[PDB]
Design a protein around this ligand. Sequence first.
Ligand SMILES: CCCCCCCCCCCCCC(=O)O
Ligand SMILES: CCCCCCCCCCCCCC(=O)O
Lengths: 67, 67, 76, 76
Amino acid sequence: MAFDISVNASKTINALVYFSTQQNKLVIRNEVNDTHYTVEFDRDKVVDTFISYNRHNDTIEIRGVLP
Amino acid sequence: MAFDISVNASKTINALVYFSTQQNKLVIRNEVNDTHYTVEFDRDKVVDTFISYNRHNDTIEIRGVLP
Amino acid sequence: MAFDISVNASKTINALVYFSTQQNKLVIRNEVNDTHYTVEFDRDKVVDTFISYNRHNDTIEIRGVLPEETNIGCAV
Amino acid sequence: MAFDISVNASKTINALVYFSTQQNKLVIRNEVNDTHYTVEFDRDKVVDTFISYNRHNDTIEIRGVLPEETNIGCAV
Ligand SMILES: CCCCCCCCCCCCCC(=O)O
Ligand SMILES: CCCCCCCCCCCCCC(=O)O
């Protein structure tokens, strides 16, 4: 189980993280202008995320894995 | 385990689905211009996806869940 | 193997996706209005689709290309 | 509780996220260059962050706001 986001580095990623009691889920929401990408996980899952810059493609990347 | 994508409905979502032998993963890649959002799953997971239009916000939505 | 499907935008396209180790196939089961499509193709082959809203006829449209060796079932 | 962290863009920010049922807290463990931040806050509180590339000083920047009742640990 993994996810990956890549955006042009002129853009800003608005990342929100919370645990919702009503949903009983860990939420990671990523917004890039009018586009949103959300992933949701159970209350006891560990998500390891890596934020980086790719110089060759001029992109910001976020990769998430379940270790 | 769930994901959700929302994009302004003037945009087109390029969704690619494949199983990679080298990664041993089911891949769902969604590209919206220069932004990409990929989710990856194990070889025997079922992903139920729903593609819809939200008239109030003028957005295309894709929601995926593991049933 | 190009395809183009559409539904009125008040409705939802529902696609179930999985890789079946026993069939050794990627399987997509799609519900499109009153219609079911079962699509099966091989590992390391891609289904490449474009999902859009057609403002001219108020539809959700999916257009794309299937691998050469694809099996398709249709039922209503 | 505003924050602003940065690393040279040749490096990676590594954030581990989980909700600990026993502590009844959302926990984020971040590695930022030579530094570790442990951040803990309550359910139904949001950490709202903005991740960008700063072309002027070649850094990855994360700026954002933490909930009022947040615990922060820092180690090098
Ligand atoms: C998560 C997005 C999945 C997109 C699934 C697209 C597959 C649609 C196949 C429809 C094939 C219909 C063929 C026909 O028109 O007779
Ligand atoms: C998946 C994205 C997660 C983003 C995590 C942002 C949390 C960063 C907290 C850093 C707090 C540092 C406080 C300080 O500068 O002393």
